[PDB]
Design a protein around this ligand. Structure first.
Ligand SMILES: [Zn+2]
Ligand SMILES: [Zn+2]
Length: 143
């Protein structure tokens, strides 16, 4: 076998079977041709979340945020920078106002809250803004 890894497309929901050795090449979805591994934060919402989290093989670090949240805006560039540094981790964002049932299901209090998921299980979480080096260190400690 080709060490197939299930990479979900957040845009059309397709469960792409991607050879492990091809992940570094950042391929596009076989159905809709959107990027599968942009090394940028992807948008999850109530209409793509369950399919994405349930079927993904790679860990997913989720930033629960809102547009009016100052600490979220402080964190956003650091979250995007760390996303570029971890090609085998999906970085995702959930807007708590757009997706209130997801925010409630994650038991969010203050934002930003980051939740690390792996194969449907919550591995770890943290809250509050962090700079990129500290965020990378936290991620490495959990994985
Ligand atoms: Zn392998
Ligand atoms: Zn697609």
């Amino acid at each position: 076998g080709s060490h197939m890894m299930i990479i979900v497309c957040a845009s059309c929901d397709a469960k792409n079977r991607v050879p492990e050795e091809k992940l570094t090449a950042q391929p596009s979805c076989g159905q809709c041709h959107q990027p599968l591994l942009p090394l940028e934060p992807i948008e999850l919402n109530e209409q793509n979340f369950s399919n994405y989290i349930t079927n993904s093989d790679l860990p997913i670090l989720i930033d629960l945020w809102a547009e009016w949240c100052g600490p979220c805006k402080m964190m956003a560039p650091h979250f995007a920078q760390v996303a570029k540094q971890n090609p085998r981790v999906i970085f995702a964002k959930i807007n708590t106002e757009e997706s209130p049932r997801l925010s409630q299901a994650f038991n969010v209090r203050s934002i930003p809250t980051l939740v690390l998921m792996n194969k449907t299980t919550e591995v770890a979480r943290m809250s509050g803004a962090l700079r990129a080096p500290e965020l990378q260190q936290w991620l490495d400690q959990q994985l």
